Design an enzyme around this catalytic site. Structure first.
Site, short mmCIF file in Angstrom:
data_model
loop_
_atom_site.label_atom_id
_atom_site.label_comp_id
_atom_site.label_asym_id
_atom_site.label_seq_id
_atom_site.Cartn_x
_atom_site.Cartn_y
_atom_site.Cartn_z
N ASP B 477 8.20 3.93 0.69
CA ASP B 477 7.99 3.42 2.03
C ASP B 477 9.11 3.86 2.99
O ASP B 477 10.06 4.54 2.61
CB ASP B 477 7.89 1.90 1.97
CG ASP B 477 7.11 1.32 3.11
OD1 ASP B 477 6.64 2.10 3.96
OD2 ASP B 477 6.99 0.08 3.15
N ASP B 539 -1.31 -0.47 7.14
CA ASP B 539 -0.99 -1.85 6.75
C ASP B 539 -2.15 -2.78 7.06
O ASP B 539 -2.27 -3.85 6.44
CB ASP B 539 0.27 -2.35 7.47
CG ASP B 539 1.54 -2.01 6.71
OD1 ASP B 539 1.41 -1.63 5.52
OD2 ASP B 539 2.65 -2.11 7.29
#
Lengths: 716, 716
Positions: B477, B539
């Protein structure tokens, strides 16, 4: 000086509107000069057009009552098959009369007013060769920039004639680009705004159901392409009629645009004997230079002051509970009282017992029986209706001190099930064509209201019903269209019969609040609003879709007119789940707010009682205010509407967020219709000047899938 | 035979694409002749334009490598500040070379291929006034109609030069109407398709964040206005770069259209000493005469075969469960094994431990501490990470007979929290500019990957982590952009550092499934995809928004590349509640299906278990098939997609109804990409000819707010 005649030039002048036409003393025809913003004094006359090809001078002029068959190849306002068999017509100007006020319309609803509010011009046409007269009525309500038109065809010959087409209103527009707005839909999705550019040829819509219908409303707007809710020029047209209709806009070969509304020709073959007269319904026309929304606001004030004749036009409507979506057909006395008790404990002031209460030999326990037998069902009401209405109307209403609950009832008089007692006795009372199959829709047939027998059957069982108990509200439903008909004449004779019925029963019971209905807005038109002060907007009770439906319906009709109920979730038509406060805030924009669910299923009583008091607080502004549709649901996911008291002291803003708004700026909602130099207190807190609220606005954020705010403004 | 050279004419030929340019013997300039469908033989030459005004001949031609400052006023592909201070550049053709295969790019990701799949032409330009060489590479993958371009600038003088702008690819289109398609968004709404007419002037987009960003993807399509998913000509352009970029499309005063993509010029000030070199990233370009969808299928097959070097490019991804949304930061050892036990119970093959496992003196219990300290938190993992990962990798998978669960982990290597040991030790490793505030986003700073210290730190702690337990999956990430930079040079220096790290780690652990992430799709580009076979798409895990997001991303990148997880409801980003089967079916369109919810909160184990088996059944088709976007979510509420096997023996059809469809007909979904004369059995039942499925289609109806259908096809 609202109507002005110089020579053969007739001028109708509103406050910010003018309508000018003249008779050509060479051809006898009526030619339009201007329909738009105010003119005065001498008007420029158009240079004569050069004629080439097949389109003669008649095809190049703006006409007011155009026929076809003498050179004009455009769509006509009138078609008459004469006794000798021609379809030619030559109605030439004969004279005119001006009078103050407005005559009634025989057997039909019409706007009404007194000598100050309205002035009327009747123009007389006559056909020398066929002995036919046409009388064109023009009324001006100058305060609302409205022009109301209607026409009479009288046969003065010695054989019959047939009116094959008769438009109530017929306007020819100069060569300019125009846009056409209509409302289209179907059951559970009525009144969706549509906007298209006007093209060479024909575009339009109408209805063939025999009623005005869910599919198209008898209403349309011509606007410049740049016209918005608050900018530019709009021309509205509304037919005051509950039957079939046809609306057509034609941009002809030469570039002028013809707009016309009236009867659906295909369901109008009206034989006129020697001395008979056909009277078209009125069409109400509004011009605005302040956008489509200015046009609406004039319509709304006109209908509330000069059309809705019921004493409730300006009175506030009690928050009600309708029992349909909570209980459907499965109930008896026991359940109805359960719903009434929970209703009054919540603060509801009127309880409506919907379908399912009637029939005896053939009980209304389903879609399939009992329509026609309008006595209470003894299986469900053993001691009759009057003792139950009695116990219901003694229940006190919470948070009220004094007032007791009112009772209302559902009926569908124009219909009959084959499985009923009425149908077994009078099977010839229904609409039908000889031996063709009697087709059902929701297992019912339509009664022939053209028969006086059927009219008096309805007038009598409703008079007896309303005198048999304490009923102060009637929901008058109508759950299918006409299919087979005994003759084309019956389409409009049915409507003349229904109007006699609605006229009798609403004059006879002026203190009943009457709500029209037709699987929702299937008969949502000015014709019904004349007798009924409010109409069930739609069977779709979903918060999200009611915003589109209520916004579209308000294009023509005042929010005071629209019934709207907070419903249960998941929604029974959409299956969508929307939070309770969103659902309520949407219903509070209807003139008649209510609940339509089992109150056993809602578990936050303080929230519901808090929303009902809010509904009562905003109801006066919805009934009497001016609507500004600040932001349209078609344009964005943040629709908003503003109700401004007629005198500017107060306002309420409804502001919604429909989709989620993930990680993004919210727009600014800017108000309008306030005083720029006045001060307004927003929701008891901050104080902004009118110019600020209008040129900057307010911004609202939400962290939810659905959001909504009702915000109040007090001037100073 | 893919590259034909005739004198100074260069021709690059594919199956249905030709790209033809030439060196003008008189001016030295590289002129474009054709970039479109196949040509061969003699090409017509444009008649010479007449020159009037300020725009000379150089402004009226189609140029391959345009400079500015010599009379062409259009946006340039290169700008060089010479040692003497001029920004002038006269790079003239000197020679060329054709090779088989394709060289790699120094320090950058790039497409690859051996002799039979790709051929490469290098054109040498040289400026004799200033001693600056420039080398343009053209590569053709004939089977995919793909031209890959890149350019080196070498300083061959004795002073420094500065590259102030260097595009990777530059095409001039002839005069014709063009539409520009791009992918715009932000966090939780990546990759929304956008389409606009190309205008006189400039239009385009780029990234100023230092990464390719959520805001715009480094991708765009030029298409004819009439071009759809399956008809018309489309030219796609994709930059193989993870850093900042700029893409500009300019219609010049004469009407030729210049398209260019490459480094963001405002974040490129690259000084080359004598002998030094700068290499642009490569730009992939695909032309298709079979609509925008044909161009995507060639992009998808080219990336799977010639870009994604991981062994997982065409391997099936195991159904996974990610802990992030079920548990967030709040857990320890005991909750991680609960989640793993329950995951194995459902048939889940891979359990990923997300954020919150690391940190010692500054534990990662929230957003505010611990990035930089990549040892397991002893308060949450008292005996270390290895004993827990041992018990987790022992759980058998239900309905699998033998397989044991695999374990994955989350890391964010390029980031540091000020509250962390790493930052107190090496506070100068972060990106910063002198004494300016170190502004944080999500409480973190960015580590300067331009420094070899940082690179070796990331390589070392990832190697020690991946060797310390049985970890077969890594979620890499990265949750903020760049702000303050020690210099402009650092923007690209950072990328060269990042790519060295990703190259090293991904080749050191070829049997780990690496998945890129960056607050969802913040680094969803061909650069990362060279090292990682899949990327967390967004997301936003809402089922309705992922349709838009996934269809959009699929415009440039293959569905095998997209990660998609079934989430819980109401959704944590949108608050929407969507049915489980709908949610599950949306996630099956990505290559790595997974769950991101607490398995104890499931309404239906049997239906979840049945949906995971269905994912395993659709996965081979999604990974290796050809995507046909049948109906776009931007065009109707019935989006639909079809995955056809490369050999056409099987197909999966995903069909969705997004909003409710109240009382209204439903459309027909028409297939494509089948054999019109084969027969295809649909869901084991009916059997239809390909032409029937393509020209008539199938129809599906739904009684609900949200519908979905997964329909399998088998040749016979």
């Amino acid at each position: 000086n609202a109507i002005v005649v110089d020579g053969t030039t007739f001028a109708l002048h509103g406050a910010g509107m003018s309508y000018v036409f003249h008779a050509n003393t060479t051809t006898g025809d009526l030619i339009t000069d201007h329909y738009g913003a105010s003119v005065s004094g001498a008007l420029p006359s158009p240079p004569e057009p050069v004629v080439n090809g097949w389109v003669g001078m008649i095809g190049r002029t703006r006409r007011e009552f155009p026929d076809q068959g003498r050179g004009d190849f455009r769509i006509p306002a009138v078609r008459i098959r004469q006794t000798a068999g021609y379809a030619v017509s030559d109605l030439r100007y004969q004279g005119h009369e001006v009078r103050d006020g407005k005559p009634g319309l025989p057997g039909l609803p019409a706007t009404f007013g007194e000598a100050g509010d309205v002035t009327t011009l009747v123009v007389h046409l006559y056909d020398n060769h066929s002995a036919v007269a046409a009388d064109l009525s023009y009324s001006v309500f100058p305060e609302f920039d409205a022009v109301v038109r209607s026409v009479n065809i009288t046969n003065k010959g010695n054989g019959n004639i047939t009116i094959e087409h008769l438009a109530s209103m017929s306007v020819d527009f100069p060569f300019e680009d125009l846009d056409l707005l209509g409302l289209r839909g179907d059951w559970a999705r009525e009144a969706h705004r549509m906007r298209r550019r006007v093209e060479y040829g024909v575009q339009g819509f109408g209805s063939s159901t025999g009623y005005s219908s869910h599919l198209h409303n008898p209403f349309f707007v011509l606007a410049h392409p740049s016209t918005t809710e608050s900018q530019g020029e709009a021309w509205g047209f509304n037919l005051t009629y509950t039957g079939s209709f046809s609306a057509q806009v034609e941009k002809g070969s030469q570039g002028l645009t013809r707009a016309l509304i009236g009867f659906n020709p295909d369901q109008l073959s009206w034989t006129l004997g020697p001395g008979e007269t056909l009277t078209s319904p009125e069409c109400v026309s509004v011009y605005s230079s302040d956008g489509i929304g200015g046009m609406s606001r004039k319509f709304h004030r006109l209908y509330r002051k000069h059309l809705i004749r019921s004493k409730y036009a300006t009175l506030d409507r009690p928050p009600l509970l309708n029992s349909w979506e909570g209980v459907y057909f499965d109930y008896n006395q026991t359940g109805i009282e359960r719903l009434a008790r929970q209703s009054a404990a919540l603060g509801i002031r009127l309880f409506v017992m919907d379908d399912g209460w009637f029939g005896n030999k053939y009980p209304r326990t389903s879609d399939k029986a009992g329509l026609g037998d309008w006595t209470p069902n003894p299986d469900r009401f053993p001691d009759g209706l009057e003792p139950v209405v009695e116990r219901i109307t003694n229940l006190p209403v919470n948070g009220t001190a004094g007032e007791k609950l009112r009772f209302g009832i559902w009926v569908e008089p124009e219909m009959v099930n084959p499985n009923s007692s009425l149908y077994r006795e009078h099977p010839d009372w229904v609409l039908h064509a000889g031996s063709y199959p009697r087709t059902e829709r929701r297992n019912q047939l339509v009664l022939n209201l053209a028969l006086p027998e059927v009219q008096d059957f309805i007038i009598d069982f409703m008079t007896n019903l309303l005198n048999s108990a304490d009923i102060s509200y009637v929901k008058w439903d109508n759950n299918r269209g006409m299919h087979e008909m005994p003759s084309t004449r019956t389409y409009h004779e049915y409507m003349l019969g229904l109007y006699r019925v609605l006229d009798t029963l609403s004059a006879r019971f002026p203190d009943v609040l009457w709500e029209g209905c037709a699987s929702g807005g299937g008969r949502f038109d000015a014709g019904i609003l004349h007798y009924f002060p409010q109409i069930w907007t739609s069977d779709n009770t979903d918060g999200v879709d009611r915003i589109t439906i209520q916004f579209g319906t308000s294009l023509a009709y005042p929010p005071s007119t629209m019934g709207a109920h907070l419903s249960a979730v998941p929604n029974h038509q959409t299956s969508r789940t929307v939070p309770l406060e969103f659902r309520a805030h949407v219903a509070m924009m209807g003139g008649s707010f209510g609940l339509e669910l089992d109150p056993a299923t809602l578990q936050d009583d303080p929230e519901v009682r808090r929303l009902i008091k809010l509904a009562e607080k905003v109801n006066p502004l919805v009934i009497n205010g001016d609507l500004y549709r600040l932001r349209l649901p078609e344009e964005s996911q943040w629709p908003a509407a503003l109700f401004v008291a007629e005198d500017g002291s107060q306002a309420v803003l409804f502001y919604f967020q429909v989709g989620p708004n993930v990680n993004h700026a919210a727009p600014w909602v800017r108000l309008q219709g306030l005083d720029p130099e006045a001060r307004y207190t927003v929701d008891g807190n901050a104080t902004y000047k009118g110019a600020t609220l209008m040129n900057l606005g307010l911004q609202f954020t939400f962290d939810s899938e659905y959001g909504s705010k009702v915000v109040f403004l007090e001037k100073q």
